[PDB]
Amino acid sequence: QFLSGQLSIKLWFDKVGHQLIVTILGAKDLPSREDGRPRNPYVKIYFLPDRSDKNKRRTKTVKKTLEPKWNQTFIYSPVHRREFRERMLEITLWDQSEFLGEILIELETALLDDEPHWYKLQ
Q: Which intervals hold domain C2?
């Protein structure tokens, strides 16, 4: 019915350094609030399993926008190629509250090409 917006994310795995680099660039086309005002958006990421603080990261919250730009790089470590079939990134967007959607990326087929890509929020 309504557009939900998209999130630009860049992923890369450093196979020698055993680290997964996740850069959450920005979002576009976020839905306004029902009252017409813009959002105060942030992104939360869990590298699962273990839903614990160690595996949790969050962007800062941008004030009053539908096109936030965070440009933040998160570093997960230690990470091992052999673990990819059993790891996923749970990426959620929030209006600081209201849930604005989720992108769930399985590591085994993730775009680990160090390029930015757009993902639809669900």
A: 9-119
